[PDB]
Subunit: 113 residues, 4 copies
Amino acid sequence: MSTTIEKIQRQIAENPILLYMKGSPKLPSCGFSAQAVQALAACGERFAYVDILQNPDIRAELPKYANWPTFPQLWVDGELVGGCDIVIEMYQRGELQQLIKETAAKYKSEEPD
Amino acid sequence: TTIEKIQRQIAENPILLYMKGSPKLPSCGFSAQAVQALAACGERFAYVDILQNPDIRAELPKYANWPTFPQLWVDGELVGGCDIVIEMYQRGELQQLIKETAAKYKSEEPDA
Amino acid sequence: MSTTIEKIQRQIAENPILLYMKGSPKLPSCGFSAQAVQALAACGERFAYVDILQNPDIRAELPKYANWPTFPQLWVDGELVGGCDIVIEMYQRGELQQLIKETAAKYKSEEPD
Amino acid sequence: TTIEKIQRQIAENPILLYMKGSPKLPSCGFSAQAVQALAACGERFAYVDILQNPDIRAELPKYANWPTFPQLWVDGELVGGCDIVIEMYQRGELQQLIKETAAKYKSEEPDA
Ligand SMILES: N[C@H](CCC(=O)N[C@@H](CS)C(=O)NCC(=O)O)C(=O)O
Ligand SMILES: N[C@H](CCC(=O)N[C@@H](CS)C(=O)NCC(=O)O)C(=O)O
Ligand SMILES: N[C@H](CCC(=O)N[C@@H](CS)C(=O)NCC(=O)O)C(=O)O
Ligand SMILES: N[C@H](CCC(=O)N[C@@H](CS)C(=O)NCC(=O)O)C(=O)O
Ligand code: FES
Ligand code: FES
Ligand code: NA
Ligand code: NA
C-alpha cells in the first residue's frame, strides 16, 4: 500500500467506465490516447477520465498496480480492459459497444426526464 | 502567423527543441530522451512545449516536413527526432554540432 | 548521396508496392509492422517487403530519406503512404484497397493462365 | 515446457533481461534503453533475445503477467519494463539492487 494506490483503487471502484489517458478527451496529448478516447466515446455512454500528465503520482504508480506499462488504460467495472490497440480492435468488432452498453445498464439508477 | 511565429522561433534560437512537456517534466519518453542527450552537450538551449502550444503541434509537422515530436532544430535547420539525436550523441556528432553552434553564435569581433 | 540511399531509391522505384517493416510478413517483430502487413496483405495483391532488422544500413538511413522517423513504411508507386496508423485507417475506410488495386492494375503485364 | 524453460531461466540467472535483439544490436529502442541502464550498473547479466525465441515471446507475457518487452528479472522476480528500469537507474535504486544481487550471489563461506 501507498496513498496513491489507495487513490487509484477508489477511482477504479467508484467509476465503472474509466480511461486513464494523456491529456483530456477534448484535448488528447498523444495519438494512442486520442484513438482510445474516440472509440470509447463513440459507444455513447458516460465515462470518466484521468489525465495522467496532470497526476504524476498516478503516472508513476499505476503501471505496476495495473500490470500494464502504458497509457491509455481503459478500466471497466474494476477490470483492466487494455490500452489503445485492444480498445480499437474491440470497437472494430462491436465488442466494446456491448461491454460498455451492459456496464452502463448495470449501474444505471436515476434517469433524465 | 502560426507559421510566422514558428519561423521566428527557428530564426532566433540557434539550438531549439520542440518537445512534449518541459526539460524538467517531459510528457513523453521520446521527448525525455532527446532533452537528456541535448542537455548532456553542455550548452544552453531553448525549448517549446508543443502540448502548451496546440497551434504549433498542428502546423509544425507540415512546415518541417517531419511528422513527429521531439524535433531538434540547430542553426535554422531540422536535425531530426529522438532516434537521430540519441544516435548522434552516441557517435559524438551531436556534441560537436552543439559546441560548434554555441561558439559560433557567441563569437565577437575584437574590442577597439 | 550514399550507396545506401541509392539502394533504397532502386527498391522504391522497382517495387510499386513496398513495405519496410520489422521482421517479415510471416513473422513480424513488432505489432506496428504486424498490423500494417495484415491490412496490406488483405488487399490481395503482390507486395514486396524489406525487413529493416536485417538491413542496418536501411534502418539507419531510410528515416531521413523518407522524412519519416519510424517503421513500418508503406511506399506505393514511389510515394510514402505512411506507417501503421495511416495504413490501417485507410483499410478501415476502404481507401487502401482502392489504391493498391489500381496500383497493381497500372503495373500488370503478364497474367497467370 | 516453454514455461518450464522460462522457469529455469528465471531460476538460474539472478539478473536476466528478456529483450528484442541483443545488447550490442537491439531491435527496439525500449530494449536498447533498458540494456544500456542495466549495463551501466557494472555487473554481468544474462539476456534472452525474444525475437529468436518465438515461443518465449508468446508465452512469457501471460506467465509474467506483464504484457511487453523488455522485462528485467532479478533474483526470480519481475522488476519491470523499460520505463521502470530507467527511472530506477535515475534514482540510483537499480544500481543498489544490481550490486546487492551480484554480491549476494558471489558470496562464499570461509575456506577451511
Ligand atoms: N500500443 C499502445 C501503446 C501505448 C503506449 O506506448 N504508451 C506510452 C507512450 S504514450 C506510455 O504510456 N508510456 C509511459 C508514460 O509515458 O508514462 C497501446 O495499445 O496502448
Ligand atoms: N521515433 C521517435 C519518436 C517520436 C514520436 O514517435 N512522436 C510521436 C508520439 S509523441 C508524435 O509526435 N506524434 C505526433 C503528435 O503526437 O503530435 C523519434 O525518432 O522522434
Ligand atoms: N504510430 C506508429 C508507430 C511506428 C513506430 O513507433 N515505430 C518505431 C518502433 S518499431 C520505430 O520504427 N523506431 C525506429 C527504429 O526502431 O528503428 C505508426 O503509425 O507507424
Ligand atoms: N513502455 C515500455 C515499452 C516496452 C513495449 O511497449 N514493448 C512493446 C513493443 S516492443 C511490446 O513488447 N509488445 C509486445 C511484443 O511485441 O511482443 C516499457 O516500459 O517497457
Ligand atoms: S506522448 Fe509520445 S508516444 Fe504517447
Ligand atoms: S519493436 Fe518495440 S515498438 Fe516496435
Ligand atoms: Na492526440
Ligand atoms: Na508482431
